[PDB]
Scaffold this active site. Sequence first.
Site, mmCIF file in Angstrom:
data_model
loop_
_atom_site.group_PDB
_atom_site.id
_atom_site.type_symbol
_atom_site.label_atom_id
_atom_site.label_comp_id
_atom_site.label_asym_id
_atom_site.label_seq_id
_atom_site.Cartn_x
_atom_site.Cartn_y
_atom_site.Cartn_z
ATOM 1 N N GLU A 1 -26.093 14.901 -2.744
ATOM 2 C CA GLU A 1 -27.026 14.525 -3.809
ATOM 3 C C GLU A 1 -28.370 15.240 -3.676
ATOM 4 O OE1 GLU A 1 -26.780 10.308 -5.077
ATOM 5 O OE2 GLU A 1 -25.956 9.973 -3.050
ATOM 6 N N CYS B 1 -18.678 6.022 -8.976
ATOM 7 C CA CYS B 1 -19.314 5.794 -7.670
ATOM 8 C C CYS B 1 -18.365 5.971 -6.500
ATOM 9 C CB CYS B 1 -19.950 4.388 -7.593
ATOM 10 S SG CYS B 1 -20.728 4.021 -5.995
ATOM 11 N N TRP C 1 -27.421 4.066 -0.046
ATOM 12 C CA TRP C 1 -27.918 5.177 0.750
ATOM 13 C C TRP C 1 -27.290 6.514 0.309
ATOM 14 C CZ3 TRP C 1 -25.249 1.100 3.231
ATOM 15 C CH2 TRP C 1 -23.907 1.379 3.512
HETATM 16 C C1 HEM Z 1 -24.323 2.333 -0.492
HETATM 17 C C2 HEM Z 1 -24.055 3.637 -0.542
HETATM 18 C C3 HEM Z 1 -23.714 4.362 -1.865
HETATM 19 C C4 HEM Z 1 -23.308 5.645 -1.939
HETATM 20 C C5 HEM Z 1 -23.075 6.639 -0.767
HETATM 21 C C6 HEM Z 1 -23.103 5.954 -3.336
HETATM 22 C C7 HEM Z 1 -22.688 7.173 -3.814
HETATM 23 C C8 HEM Z 1 -22.790 7.572 -5.127
HETATM 24 C C9 HEM Z 1 -22.903 8.937 -5.607
HETATM 25 C C10 HEM Z 1 -22.945 10.212 -4.733
HETATM 26 C C11 HEM Z 1 -22.944 8.896 -6.942
HETATM 27 C C12 HEM Z 1 -23.075 10.118 -7.870
HETATM 28 C C13 HEM Z 1 -24.570 10.277 -8.103
HETATM 29 C C14 HEM Z 1 -24.896 11.439 -8.985
HETATM 30 O O1 HEM Z 1 -24.262 12.513 -8.804
HETATM 31 O O2 HEM Z 1 -25.804 11.276 -9.844
HETATM 32 C C15 HEM Z 1 -22.877 7.504 -7.367
HETATM 33 C C16 HEM Z 1 -22.881 7.027 -8.666
HETATM 34 C C17 HEM Z 1 -23.037 5.710 -9.042
HETATM 35 N N1 HEM Z 1 -23.233 4.632 -8.175
HETATM 36 FE FE1 HEM Z 1 -22.991 4.657 -6.093
HETATM 37 N N2 HEM Z 1 -23.396 4.829 -4.103
HETATM 38 C C18 HEM Z 1 -23.785 3.820 -3.228
HETATM 39 C C19 HEM Z 1 -24.192 2.554 -3.618
HETATM 40 C C20 HEM Z 1 -24.245 2.052 -4.906
HETATM 41 C C21 HEM Z 1 -24.790 0.766 -5.331
HETATM 42 C C22 HEM Z 1 -25.465 -0.274 -4.391
HETATM 43 C C23 HEM Z 1 -24.623 0.677 -6.661
HETATM 44 C C24 HEM Z 1 -24.993 -0.480 -7.621
HETATM 45 C C25 HEM Z 1 -25.124 -1.757 -7.215
HETATM 46 C C26 HEM Z 1 -23.948 1.886 -7.104
HETATM 47 C C27 HEM Z 1 -23.572 2.183 -8.389
HETATM 48 C C28 HEM Z 1 -23.358 3.440 -8.901
HETATM 49 C C29 HEM Z 1 -23.256 3.708 -10.312
HETATM 50 C C30 HEM Z 1 -23.343 2.703 -11.494
HETATM 51 C C31 HEM Z 1 -23.037 5.222 -10.411
HETATM 52 C C32 HEM Z 1 -22.844 6.012 -11.729
HETATM 53 C C33 HEM Z 1 -24.173 6.539 -12.255
HETATM 54 C C34 HEM Z 1 -24.011 7.100 -13.643
HETATM 55 O O3 HEM Z 1 -23.010 6.761 -14.346
HETATM 56 O O4 HEM Z 1 -24.907 7.896 -14.037
HETATM 57 N N3 HEM Z 1 -23.743 2.695 -6.018
HETATM 58 N N4 HEM Z 1 -22.774 6.735 -6.226
HETATM 59 C C1 LIG Z 2 -29.788 12.035 -13.674
HETATM 60 N N1 LIG Z 2 -28.595 12.097 -13.267
HETATM 61 C C2 LIG Z 2 -27.557 11.313 -13.925
HETATM 62 C C3 LIG Z 2 -27.786 9.844 -13.660
HETATM 63 C C4 LIG Z 2 -28.328 9.013 -14.652
HETATM 64 N N2 LIG Z 2 -28.537 7.706 -14.428
HETATM 65 C C5 LIG Z 2 -28.241 7.168 -13.232
HETATM 66 C C6 LIG Z 2 -27.706 7.954 -12.204
HETATM 67 O O1 LIG Z 2 -27.402 7.394 -10.990
HETATM 68 C C7 LIG Z 2 -26.834 8.195 -9.963
HETATM 69 C C8 LIG Z 2 -26.681 7.310 -8.764
HETATM 70 C C9 LIG Z 2 -26.544 5.936 -8.936
HETATM 71 C C10 LIG Z 2 -26.428 5.118 -7.819
HETATM 72 C C11 LIG Z 2 -26.452 5.673 -6.543
HETATM 73 C C12 LIG Z 2 -26.338 4.860 -5.423
HETATM 74 C C13 LIG Z 2 -26.367 5.458 -4.168
HETATM 75 C C14 LIG Z 2 -26.490 6.840 -4.039
HETATM 76 N N3 LIG Z 2 -26.511 7.409 -2.805
HETATM 77 N N4 LIG Z 2 -26.612 7.604 -5.142
HETATM 78 C C15 LIG Z 2 -26.591 7.050 -6.376
HETATM 79 C C16 LIG Z 2 -26.713 7.862 -7.491
HETATM 80 C C17 LIG Z 2 -27.475 9.312 -12.414
#
Ligand code: HEM
Ligand SMILES: C=NCc1cncc(OCc2ccc3ccc(N)nc3c2)c1
Lengths: 407, 411
Positions: free
Chosen positions: B285, B108, B280
Amino acid sequence: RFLKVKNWETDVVLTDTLHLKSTLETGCTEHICMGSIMLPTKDQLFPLAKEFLDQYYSSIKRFGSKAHMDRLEEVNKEIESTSTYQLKDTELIYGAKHAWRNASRCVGRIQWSKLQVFDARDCTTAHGMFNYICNHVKYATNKGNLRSAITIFPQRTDGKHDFRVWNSQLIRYAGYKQPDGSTLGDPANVQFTEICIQQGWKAPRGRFDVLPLLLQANGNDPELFQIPPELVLEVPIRHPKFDWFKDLGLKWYGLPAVSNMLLEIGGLEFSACPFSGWYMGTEIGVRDYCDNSRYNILEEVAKKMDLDMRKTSSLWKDQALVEINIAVLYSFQSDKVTIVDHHSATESFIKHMENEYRCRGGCPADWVWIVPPMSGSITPVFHQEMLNYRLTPSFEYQPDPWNTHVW
Amino acid sequence: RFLKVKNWETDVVLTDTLHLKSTLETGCTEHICMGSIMLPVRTKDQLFPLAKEFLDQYYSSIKRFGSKAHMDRLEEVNKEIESTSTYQLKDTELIYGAKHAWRNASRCVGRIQWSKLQVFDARDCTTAHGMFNYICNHVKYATNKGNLRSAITIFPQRTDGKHDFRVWNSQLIRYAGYKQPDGSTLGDPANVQFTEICIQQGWKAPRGRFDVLPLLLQANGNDPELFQIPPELVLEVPIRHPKFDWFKDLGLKWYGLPAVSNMLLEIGGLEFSACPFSGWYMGTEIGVRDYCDNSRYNILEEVAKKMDLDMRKTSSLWKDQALVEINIAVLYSFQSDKVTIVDHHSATESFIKHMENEYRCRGGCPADWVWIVPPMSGSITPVFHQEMLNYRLTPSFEYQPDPWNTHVWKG
Ligand code: HEM
Ligand SMILES: C=NCc1cncc(OCc2ccc3ccc(N)nc3c2)c1
Ligand code: HEM
Ligand SMILES: C=NCc1cncc(OCc2ccc3ccc(N)nc3c2)c1
Ligand SMILES: C[C@H](O)[C@H](O)[C@H]1CNc2nc(N)[nH]c(=O)c2N1
Ligand SMILES: C[C@H](O)[C@H](O)[C@H]1CNc2nc(N)[nH]c(=O)c2N1
Ligand SMILES: [Zn+2]
């Protein structure tokens, strides 16, 4: 133990068996992935010689043959006696081509079997080295129709008689530090440009001065030599839409010729083994020109395009970056110099991966290096899972000579 | 053991001691790196060390480690486990757990925001209708008329794995995908399977390009039920380009609230199988992945046509060119409508500072380079040049299988 990799854009799944032949270590553990870290004797010798010889003779459908056993016997006897041994020409070529084949960070490996190997093991002097290198350059350049080549200098013996090319690439622009506080030329080479001066070089103190060669034979002190200007093919950089682009005064050389690595074959260590292919456009346009600690020209190009540089969310850097890269490709192609774009090369690599899996059982690949430094997810390699592991023969990193050289 | 990482653009070298508190495995070994692999019922036996470790962390963080409140809480949980084979988290613990799970999420880029997270405790929930209500409130609260607020809603923890709460949607808001008999896909191809499920479950599909999917909610292990999010709660943004007037005619829009609902939250051994969370969007994305992946909306060609780029040779970089314009349009549109969004430059820049802060204050920051680096313009962002150590800390967000692959149907 039998691993699967998935392409997520295409659902293709390959099964990797090749990794079980992996020998060297990755730097990672079950508790930590170091995937994004840049750099993570007779009894030692023979197994290494044996393992190489085993794969060689298998590759030529002569595993377990008298010729095989004879060679093992012969090399084993030579090791026992000399404490080292010499490769047959054939083995040397296989070894080199396979070091490329195994280079997990190389996106251009589809070309791996078509490598021109120059045996320079009879070389004894830096003048000699210079001669061998001029020949490599002319051959590889080929008036713009580039040909892959490697030149192999004598193998390490006792580490006191090492052959080394002190330049990181055969051709590279100089870097000078101004009293102004900035940097003129290529900042990546500031220290090396200094050591050239320290050892005698008369720098023209310019923005694109081709560095002199600094060649080290038999562990002796390194010597300076200027590559014949007529052998250094350069491309002036113009844009097919912006005529102001030419006024930026940018050029680049056609020949990427990496000279600072270590070639390991059958346990033998070739400290001087310069090799060359041809550029992927992004190496120059994205990295060389736009990296902050390089030519860093992004601001100027943007300003000339009159983009809104106030907020990063205008994506002006992104726009400029694209244009700059368009120009690099346009210039090279217009001058009939070989170049591949990041789309063609990554697509080629996917086909190659599929070939290696189908014909060899897998293909070691470092995603962090394979995905181009621009437009990543719109290239197929982005969606391709990769397994990274170290096969031998290999190209390895080695310390910079000045930090080592017993002066 | 100390581990150093280097930024090759600035020569900053940081020292990681935090990886020492790592437990879970990476997939990697000394002989293979699986760093680019996407995906590489718990007894009382294994439960108490997990609880203790969590509670030890929690009480350190509040500077009460080894205090009587600490000791008594360990006692209480210990007893509650041997009596009930599980235990319940205090509100304070849940909130701490949720935040630290985000903080530990190595993929993240947005973690600078980890400490400001609105925790919605939905552990009193018993039915799907109760779930719908909780989610609605989450959506309304997090949306905040475009001024987005990070939130998470935590439904009841797993018990025997036979009574699971699950949100069947991968995101609270997502567009329907429809396979056509000719092979083409109408709508988001990422959702054809889920769309089909919804349809089978009774959903009347509008069959359009941007139909918001219904919530499919499972409470207590019972069969899931369909619910329509009130449209007034679904904030969407029409996509236009600041200089290109034909761009609006491409008919594109996106939803403002990215709210991921298919993950599992783990806290002190306890598993929360339904914990939808939202932040957000980073512009890429949508603009790079959602619009431009060949397996998604795949609009690059149509945008390229309209731009009249030279599309005969890929060395024109017509693809790269079109990608940038689309991402410009996505950011412009959101900003114009005052819906919170961040560009990939700002986000990666913030992440570097966050990460440095984390090394100093915490002894490390686990980070997955493959995921952190943006899917366009990678090296012109500062993360590309940053070395990163990836490892797994708890609390954490974990993948879990799609519920339709494991659910036992009641009828
Ligand atoms: C608040 C603004 C946030 C931004 C800009 C952000 C940004 C991102 C982005 C761009 C990704 C990659 C997504 C993808 O390519 O699928 C990501 C992944 C992730 N985010 Fe964040 N995020 C935010 C908030 C959060 C919050 C609130 C949580 C949980 C409470 C979180 C937990 C995660 C997790 C667990 C992943 C990994 C997903 C996976 O392993 O498939 N994020 N984030
Ligand atoms: C399907 N794509 C892989 C995938 C699988 N399972 C969960 C995923 O989460 C991506 C993800 C998780 C949390 C986010 C929070 C904020 C944000 N802007 N993007 C976010 C994007 C992504
Ligand atoms: C012929 C066309 C070739 C292309 C298009 C190509 C492409 C590339 C690219 C883009 C990289 C990333 C390097 C960087 O970003 O600095 C790379 C790395 C590498 N290439 Fe190739 N290459 C070619 C030929 C060769 C040849 C002939 C050899 C050796 C015989 C070779 C061996 C390597 C090695 C060892 C690396 C990784 C070096 C390191 O770890 O730093 N390549 N290649
Ligand atoms: C400087 N960056 C790290 C680094 C260190 N040591 C050697 C390196 O070489 C990269 C490299 C190696 C071989 C190449 C062959 C062809 C090509 N077009 N680029 C190539 C690029 C890179
Ligand atoms: C820190 C990170 O490992 C480093 O910047 C790497 C990332 N990927 C790369 N990929 C290529 N092709 N070349 C590079 O020099 C790098 N640098
Ligand atoms: C194979 C590879 O791991 C896969 O395509 C990854 C690459 N990096 C990613 N990075 C982000 N942020 N999101 C993704 O979905 C992916 N996909
Ligand atoms: Zn790894």
